[PDB]
């Protein structure tokens, strides 16, 4: 939920920062300079991805042979569909009763 989305956003931001640092290093070392030293840090950012790789290497890996999270748990979804259907049926019955009452006048 929260932690999974946070780690995903963190990995996405890490990839974006790595791409930006690579582009900046290319633009700096292409033409003209001490700032090019920070370009080396871009390579360090690449190592961060490797750490993420390590983070993916020594990750959960529950089975690594099948798919986890058994069951879509959509029984609740089906129950909600039935509830909405009952609500619609009640609305239809109420509309019929209202038409009958209006005809009574």
């Amino acid at each position: 939920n929260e932690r999974l989305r946070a780690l995903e956003d963190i990995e996405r931001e890490i990839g974006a920062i790595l791409q930006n640092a690579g582009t900046a290093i290319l633009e700096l070392s292409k033409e003209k300079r001490l700032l090019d030293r920070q370009a080396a840090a871009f390579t360090t950012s690449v190592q961060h991805v490797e750490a993420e790789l390590s983070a993916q290497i020594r990750y959960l890996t529950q089975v690594a042979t099948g798919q986890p999270h058994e069951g879509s748990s959509y029984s609740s979804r089906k129950d909600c569909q039935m509830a909405l259907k009952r609500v619609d049926y009640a609305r239809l019955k109420i509309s019929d009763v209202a038409r009958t009452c209006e005809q009574m006048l």
């Binding site: 999974l4 633009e27 292409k30 003209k32 058994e70 069951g71 879509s72 029984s75 049926y89």
Partner: protein, 315 residues
């Protein structure tokens, strides 16, 4: 178009290289350091490198702008969103994990890859594969007739998401129809019934032409919802936890016979017959209520000068 020009340029370069190699077939003897053109060469190399870096930066900026707009995140981003919003995906090539219900349904086996596609308002357009068509039950009782035996001539927001949902719905409907058919054919002589490839009807008593029928593209709503809920509750029960300590892995009703002696209670509390019989007796209750209402109406219309009997249903 451009392929021919590229091939011609490559052939010209190859011919020039072959001519150079033939002329050659760098060499000092034993017996661009000009500082004038090297400046221009370094300037041109720096310009080319800057142009390449600018192109790479433009591509990266376009990618970042596409990632910023949370409306076309088809680059495995909306895919992850739907994965967190749908069942698991045993990825063989790109995506699998249909609504097999092998963990929540436990019915007619139907599993495999269903939707793995990444192309392109600009949705990924998951393929719905494979009934791929609406199918629901319709019921009514208006001038019923038991005489049958004819053909099945029917008298009837995310888009891919609801498509997949309706696909799962029609899949489970087919499963439960197969289950009810197997029950009607494997049941005892409790009551006769009519089973056709797609239309079912029973007769527990005269004037009971229960009009439940599996439709497909090839009261009137409450009873079908009731049937669906009862069958899915049956499956859910087939999946409460057994509270196992050594290895019960069952139901507490089994172990309750130990301390609490149950001559026939435990037999009755283990399992019973359901499905078609329960819906049939529900329709029986319905027709009984209808007959009671008809008796009341007949008394009101006929015994009007008589003391007006007054009824009130329960809650």
């Amino acid at each position: 178009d451009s392929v021919r020009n590229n091939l011609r340029s490559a052939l010209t370069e190859m011919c020039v290289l072959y001519d150079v190699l033939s002329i050659v077939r760098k060499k000092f003897m034993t017996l661009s350091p000009q500082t004038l053109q090297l400046i221009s060469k370094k300037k041109s190399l720096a310009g080319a490198a800057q142009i390449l870096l600018k192109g790479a930066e433009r591509l990266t900026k376009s990618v970042a702008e596409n990632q910023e707009n949370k409306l076309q995140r088809d680059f495995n981003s909306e895919l992850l969103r739907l994965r967190q919003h749908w069942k698991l995906r045993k990825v063989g090539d790109k995506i699998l994990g249909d609504l097999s219900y092998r963990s929540a349904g436990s019915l007619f086996p139907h599993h495999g890859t269903f939707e793995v596609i990444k192309n392109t308002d600009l949705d990924k357009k998951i393929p719905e594969d494979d009934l791929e068509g609406s199918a629901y039950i319709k019921v009514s009782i208006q001038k019923q007739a038991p005489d049958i035996g004819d053909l099945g001539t029917v008298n009837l927001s995310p888009h891919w998401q609801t498509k997949l949902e309706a696909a799962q719905n029609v899949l489970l409907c087919k499963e439960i129809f197969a289950q009810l058919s197997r029950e009607a054919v494997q049941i005892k002589s409790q009551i006769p019934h009519i089973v056709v490839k797609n239309q079912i009807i029973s007769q527990p008593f005269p004037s009971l032409q229960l009009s439940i029928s599996l439709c497909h593209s090839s009261d009137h709503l409450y009873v079908l919802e009731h049937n669906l809920h009862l069958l899915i509750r049956e499956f859910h029960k087939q999946t409460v936890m057994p509270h196992p300590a050594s290895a019960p892995f069952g139901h507490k009703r089994m172990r309750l016979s130990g301390p609490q002696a149950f001559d026939k209670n435990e037999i009755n509390s283990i399992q019973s017959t359901e499905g078609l019989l329960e819906k049939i007796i529900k329709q029986a209750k319905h027709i009984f209520l209808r007959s009671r209402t008809a008796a009341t109406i007949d008394s009101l219309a006929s015994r009007i000068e008589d003391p007006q009997i007054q009824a009130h249903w329960s809650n």
